[PDB]
Amino acid sequence: MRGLSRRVQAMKPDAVVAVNAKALELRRQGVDLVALTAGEPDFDTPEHVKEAARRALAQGKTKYAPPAGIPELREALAEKFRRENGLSVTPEETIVTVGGSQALFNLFQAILDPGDEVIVLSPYWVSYPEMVRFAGGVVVEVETLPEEGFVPDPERVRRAITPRTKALVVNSPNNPTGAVYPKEVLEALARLAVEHDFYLVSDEIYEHLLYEGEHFSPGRVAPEHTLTVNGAAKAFAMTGWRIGYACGPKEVIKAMASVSRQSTTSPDTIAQWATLEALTNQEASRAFVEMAREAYRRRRDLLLEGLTALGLKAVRPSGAFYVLMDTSPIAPDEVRAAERLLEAGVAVVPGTDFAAFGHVRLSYATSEENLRKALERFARVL
């Protein structure tokens, strides 16, 4: 006959793509609002990366690359993972995907079989459930109270494990909470993964925007269970470039590569080479990051002081560039609250799809002047 699939019909739109369009036609019509929806860093990607891309175009590095990505990058990848993380992977247990998304997607398609349960920790990033389910998974979620600073309690994460449980998904530095879990909790969870025998999917990516704490990887602890997902996007201001990467069990990272070969065929060649440089040129990249962090950090202190001065309540993030604000007095729920704020010319993303009810996700990853302006517009609404 004709008609769409159950899976596609069944899937929810987007918390953030929504607020974006509904800016532009408010913003497209005179009304200038301030937009704190941001997932991307205001900074432009580094000149040596841009450079390297140019070098590739020139050399004619424009043909089909391997499904798992170019050797040079995989090789350089297995190295960042050791140097920076203590993971001890070889280039065969490394893969470069079309962004950290394609990694998370191709992962769940390789493990997840229908009815398999994936434990997920709320407040959580919008897409985990969508993609768990798209594969035929079953989201089994565990809350993380704000009083206990949004860091998982091992004991209860334990009492969510069932014989159908196939994966646990931990993300530190946290989006949308900004929390950064201590070593011995990643230690703890990594252990339940080994104990009950199921993968542990760690979405590291925000590792470098770390203001206060120490970033621990569980793949140091449970290497034959852990799947460590990272990407170029957030650290190197390379979101539009579309490059992410991962490492773990040789076998699953080839199930992944074969989905990749039939879905995208292989990431855009130019960008691979461009990434190779951000990775191999320590000294240059070491500085961009260094500049970006302290940068976001001052905005992080700006938002929070003005926010707290205003009366609004929020959890001081230690990493990433998000802040879940308590819309409690600005409205009675997080949706009418959201509109009230769009009315004060400031686009926020409702905590609804993150299971962060009665909260809205602020983003200081934009300008110093938008946090000053957005904080002024909040001020009047109150």
Ligand X SMILES: Cc1ncc(COP(=O)(O)O)c(CN[C@@H](Cc2c[nH]c3ccccc23)C(=O)O)c1O
The reply on whether position 318 binds ligand X by CB under 6 A is no
CB of 344 to its own copies, least distance (A): 25
Sole residue written with tokens 């240059």? 284
Q: Is 241 annotated as a binding residue?
A: no
- The one of ligand X, its own copies, none whose footprint includes residue 171, by CB under 5 to 8 A per kind, is ligand X
Which structure tokens are listed for 30? 């005179």
Q: Is 352 in the site for ligand X (CB under 6 A)?
A: no
Closest of 321, 285, 318 to residue 84, by C-alpha: 285
| Of 115, 97, 94, the residue nearest 106 (C-alpha) | 97
Q: Name residues contacting ligand X, limited to 252-271 (CB under 6 A).
A: 265
- Residue 80 interacting entry, from its own copies, ligand X, none, C-beta within 5 to 8 Å by type: none
Instruction: Determine the Cα–Cα distance for residues 161 and 320; give it in Å rounded to an integer.
Output: 28
- Which partner from the list ligand X, its own copies, none does 16 bind, CB cut-off 5 to 8 Å by kind? ligand X
Token pair of 354 as six digits: 């993150």
Minimum CB–partner distance for residue 356 and its own copies (Å): 20
- Near its own copies in 44-73, by CB under 8 A: 44-45, 50, 53-54, 57-58, 60-67
Rounded to a whole number of angstroms, the minimum distance from the CB of residue 99 to ligand X is 3
Task: Please compute Rg for the chain using Cα positions.
Answer: 21
Q: Does 11 bind its own copies (CB under 8 A)?
A: yes
- Does the annotation place 83 within a ligand binding site? no
> How far is residue 340's CA from residue 378's CA, in Å, rounded to a whole number?
10
DSSP 176-212: TT-----HHHHHHHHHHHHHTT-EEEEE-GGGG-BSS
Q: What angle do CA 185, 189, 190 make, to 5 degrees?
A: 110
Q: What is the DSSP letter of 353?
A: G
> Any known ligand binding at 336?
no
The least CB distance from residue 104 to ligand X, in Å, is 7
CA distances in angstroms from 174 to 207, 321, 365, listed in the order given = 10, 9, 15
Q: What is the DSSP string of 108-153?
A: HHHS--TT-EEEEEES--THHHHHHHHHT-EEEEEE--TTTTT---
Nearer to its own copies by Cβ, of 7 and 83: the residue is 7
**75 binds its own copies per the rule CB under 8 A:** no
Residues 152-191 that bind ligand X (CB under 6 A): 171, 175
Q: Name which position in 4, 214, 283, 369 contacts its own copies (CB under 8 A).
A: 4
Q: Which of 73, 180, 185, 237 binds its own copies (CB under 8 A)?
A: 237
- Per CB under 6 A, does 375 bind ligand X? no
Examine residue 284 and tell whether it contacts its own copies (CB under 8 A): no
Q: Which of residues 179-218 bind its own copies (CB under 8 A)?
A: 197-199
Cα separation, 216 vs 14, in Å, equals 31
Residue 244, interface with ligand X (CB under 6 A)?
A: yes
Is residue 64 near ligand X by the rule CB under 6 A? Answer: yes
134 binds its own copies (CB under 8 A): yes
Residue 3 within binding range of its own copies, rule CB under 8 A: yes
CA distance 246 to 223: 13
Binding residues: 39, 125, 175, 361
Annotated binding site for L-aspartate: which residue ranges?
A: 39, 125, 175, 361
